[PDB]
Design a protein around this ligand. Structure first.
Ligand SMILES: O=C(c1ccccc1)c1ccc(CSc2ncnc3[nH]cnc23)cc1
Length: 167
């Protein structure tokens, strides 16, 4: 039993809700919140900009030190950093950005990072400003993630379309 509330169950292990991931993180304080990161951990907009804003820029400060030490992530890769006031940990996961020309096949590799964590609160990878089809992202999530994932979808219209079209 966990504290996630109001989710629709899609499969044995995947759950979905129309919710602001920032507000959901602040309420649940999950062990792991997933950020829709880029390789530079520059949290300017989309989910990343919103999560970072909620940390009063502490996420960005921590991230800049991480990059200075380790260099950029790989597309499809991830790193674990602090969750600040939102979660115990933040799993920064880089899905391919279609608006940059990145291989959409890397979306499966990106979701594989979730399997290193038993339970996660997450957005749909590569959705939103990353330019991929969210219906496809949900399909890859369900077919790749085996751990327990709670998906927060900000847009109500998109949430309804994802549920109604789910196979
Ligand atoms: O401006 C703030 C703010 C943050 C901290 C403190 C005060 C104000 C803001 C802005 C946007 C959002 C929406 S989060 C989101 N965006 C995009 N895609 C998603 N998929 C799931 N969730 C999302 C929430 C808060």
């Amino acid at each position: 039993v966990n504290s996630f509330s109001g989710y629709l169950k899609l499969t044995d292990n995947v759950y979905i809700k129309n919710a602001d991931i920032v507000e959901e993180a602040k309420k649940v304080k999950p062990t792991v919140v997933v950020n829709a990161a880029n390789v530079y951990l520059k949290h300017g907009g989309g989910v990343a900009g919103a999560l970072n804003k909620a940390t009063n820029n502490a996420m960005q400060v921590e991230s800049d030190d991480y990059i200075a030490t380790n260099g950029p992530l790989k597309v499809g890769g991830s790193c674990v950093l602090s969750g600040h006031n939102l979660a115990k940990h933040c799993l920064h996961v880089v899905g391919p950005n279609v608006n940059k020309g990145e291989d959409i096949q890397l979306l499966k590799s990106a979701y594989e990072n979730f399997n290193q964590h038993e339970v996660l609160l997450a957005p749909l990878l590569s959705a939103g400003i990353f330019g991929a089809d969210p219906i496809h992202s949900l399909r890859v999530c369900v077919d790749t993630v085996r751990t327990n994932v709670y998906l927060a979808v900000f847009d109500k219209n998109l949430y309804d379309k994802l549920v109604s079209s789910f196979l």
